[PDB]
Amino acid sequence: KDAWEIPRESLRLEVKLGQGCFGEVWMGTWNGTTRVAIKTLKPGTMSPEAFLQEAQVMKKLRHEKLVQLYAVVSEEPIYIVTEYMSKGCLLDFLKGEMGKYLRLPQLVDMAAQIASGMAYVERMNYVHRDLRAANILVGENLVCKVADFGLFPIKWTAPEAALYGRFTIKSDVWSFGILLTELTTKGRVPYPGMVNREVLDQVERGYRMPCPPECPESLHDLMCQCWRKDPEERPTFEYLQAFLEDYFTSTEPQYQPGENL
Ligand SMILES: CC(C)(C)c1cc(NC(=O)Nc2ccc(Nc3ncnc4ccccc34)cc2)n(-c2cccc(N)c2)n1
């Protein structure tokens, strides 16, 4: 009914990108010229108004470092259409062919951009709740955009969230820090060796991950401020961004290209 709507002759479903739970994800072309990502609803495997809740958010939330909602088709079969990202999600990108070649400069930059997005989310008074490498999209020239693929991620979750349901932007700052390890370890699931329950008692007993192999120390300090027990001591995203944008000038101007970072 609104300005976002387009005919289905414009939509060229070309290559599939996995069957979700309540539909499929598609790589394709809109208006025969624009590389596009299409999300499907399998009719009557979910409330229509539930499936369109997505686009209603993506309309509200617009920023260079966020997913772009392109277009909707809001009559069965229903199609949500969003800007295509050539590299797919960050997690894949990290532990795939390219991981080999990424260093701290490329990694902190990706991280800078995420913060940038997540900072707009701050200014929006919205919470994410599942910020983490699986939820970031990469495209050309290492562009990173915040997203949510619709995917119990306790390992990434702040204890006030995992425990008492107390979900804030500060609990998103906890995730960021975890994400900072995903980036510094090229994909490796945080708290290796630990089963969930184990993690949960452990960070309550105050345990944090060590600085990973060859990651500088000021990157870890930064991580730790994200993992402060008290939710309100954690840095603002505005802070984090700045910190990371200025990193190799203001913090590691003495940084030397390593074996893995
Ligand atoms: C912005 C915020 C955080 C507010 C947001 C964003 C989304 N939704 C998405 O981000 N959806 C999404 C759309 C398309 C792809 N796939 C892809 N998109 C582009 N390129 C790809 C290249 C390869 C593979 C895939 C894709 C992945 C996720 N939110 C949301 C709200 C309510 C329910 C659900 N479930 C999500 N909230």
Torsion angles phi and psi, residue 171, rounded to 5: -70, -25
The two three-digit tokens of residue 139, written as one number: 């495209």
Residues 76 and 137 in one domain: no
Residue 259 lies inside a defined structural domain of this protein: no
Full residue range of the structural domain in which residue 146 is found: 85-254
Residues 95 and 165 in one domain: yes
Q: Whose CA is nearest to atom 1 of ligand 1?
A: 147
Centre of ligand 1 to C-alpha 251, Å, is: 34
R_g of the chain computed on alpha carbons: 19
Q: Whose CA is nearest to atom 24 of ligand 1?
A: 88
Residue 260 lies inside a defined structural domain of this protein: no
**What is the tally of structural domains in the chain?**
2
The dihedral region occupied by 186, where left means phi > 0, alpha psi between -120 and 50, and beta the remainder, is left
Largest CA distance in the chain: 58
Residue whose entry in the numeric block shows the structure tokens 């204890």: 159
Residues 121 and 185 in one domain: yes
Q: Who's near 19: CB < 8 A, 6+ residues apart?
A: 25
Residues 79 and 111 in one domain: no
Residues 101 and 57 in one domain: no
Residue 59 lies inside a defined structural domain of this protein: yes
Q: Residues with Cβ within 6 A of ligand 1?
A: 17, 25, 37, 39, 53-54, 57-58, 61, 66-67, 82, 84-85, 88, 128, 137, 146-150
Residue 246 lies inside a defined structural domain of this protein: yes
Centre of ligand 1 to C-alpha 149, Å, is: 5
Residue 60 CA to residue 108 CA, distance in Å, equals 28
Residues 74 and 141 in one domain: no
